[PDB]
Design a binder for this molecule. Structure first.
Ligand SMILES: *CC(=O)Nc1ccc(NC(=O)C*)cc1
Length: 129
């Protein structure tokens, strides 16, 4: 199987909540072609759904090097840092995801802006404690 076919099989497993199996298929595609960003971005989300944040950080770091303009990778990076309460970095990454989304016209409705507000509100909440 080619790397593209492996990404498609990992995608099918992800839709069925098969997160660990999907991450294995994404690692497959990385072995075959390790220079495609979305392979890391998709597996990062698998790790993110698996409560393994440090693992999710790494893949978000790998994706943003192959594609510094990736809206999805910045979005998962910020959400991952948010769940780890790294609020300032998280808001900065969600903000850049929003900036890139408007540049590439990937800003749909109030989606990413609502993520910003939820992150900023959670940051305000923790500062008080
Ligand atoms: C195709 C696919 O994976 N869709 C999808 C829909 C919803 C969610 N999760 C929630 O709505 C909370 C994940 C994936």
């Amino acid at each position: 199987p080619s790397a593209q076919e492996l990404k498609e099989q990992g995608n099918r497993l992800f839709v069925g909540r098969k997160y660990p199996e999907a991450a294995a298929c994404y690692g497959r595609a990385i072995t075959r072609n390790p220079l495609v960003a979305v392979y890391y971005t998709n597996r990062a989300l698998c790790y993110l759904k698996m409560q393994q944040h440090e693992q999710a950080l790494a893949d978000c770091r790998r994706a943003l090097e192959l594609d510094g303009q990736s809206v999805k990778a910045h979005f998962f990076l910020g959400q991952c840092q948010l769940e780890m309460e790294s609020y300032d970095e998280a808001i900065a990454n969600l903000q850049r995801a929003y900036s890139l989304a408007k540049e590439q016209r990937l800003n749909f409705g109030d989606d990413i802006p609502s993520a910003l507000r939820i992150a900023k509100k959670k940051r305000w909440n923790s500062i008080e404690e």
